[PDB]
Amino acid sequence: LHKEPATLIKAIDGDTVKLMYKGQPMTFRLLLVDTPEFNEKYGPEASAFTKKMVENAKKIEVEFDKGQRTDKYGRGLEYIYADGKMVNEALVRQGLAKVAYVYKGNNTHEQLLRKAEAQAKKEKLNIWS
Ligand SMILES: Cc1cn([C@H]2C[C@H](OP(=O)(O)O)[C@@H](COP(=O)(O)O)O2)c(=O)[nH]c1=O
Numbered sequence: 542l543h544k545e546p547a548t549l550i551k552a553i554d555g556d557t558v559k560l561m562y563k564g565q566p567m568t569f570r571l572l573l574v575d576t577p578e579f580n581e582k583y584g585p586e587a588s589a590f591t592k593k594m595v596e597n598a599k600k601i602e603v604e605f606d607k608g609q610r611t612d613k614y615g616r617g618l619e620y621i622y623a624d625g626k627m628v629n630e631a632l633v634r635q636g637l638a639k640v641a642y643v644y645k646g647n648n649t650h651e652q653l654l655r656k657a658e659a660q661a662k663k664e665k666l667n668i669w670s
């Protein structure tokens with residue numbers, strides 16, 4: 542897997558970000574995770590967390606997996622890094638996302654994310670409290 546440059550256009554919610562990628566605006570949906578919708582409990586904290594993370598970052602990168610790069614809505618499917626920290630993992634580690642939407646072929650970082658979910662659950666953080 543490889544990291545590619547992109548630039549923040551707009552934070553959207555906990556697990557969707559608008560980024561400019563190869564000079565085109567695209568909506569990017571985070572692989573392997575599900576944040577609450579803004580209207581649900583922890584949804585605002587998940588949107589807030591992703592927002593800070595991507596807005597504070599000096600360098601945003603996207604990393605596609607081995608499988609589909611777009612979903613059926615035309616959204617990118619990817620891992621996002623904020624100054625080398627994976628957003629997908631960080632949300633799960635804080636108990637602001639669950640591991641979800643694990644489809645074979647786009648699941649390189651599954652174990653890593655499950656490990657973080659385990660430690661979040663252990664600490665009873667946020668969604669696990
Ligand atoms: C994360 C992810 C979501 N999706 C689709 C499945 C879901 O379809 P349905 O909309 O038909 O339920 C939807 C969930 O996205 P959100 O959690 O953003 O709503 O996005 C994929 O197809 N592949 C993926 O890797």
Ligand SMILES: [Ca+2]
Nearest residue numbers: 556575576577
């Ligand atoms: Ca969601």
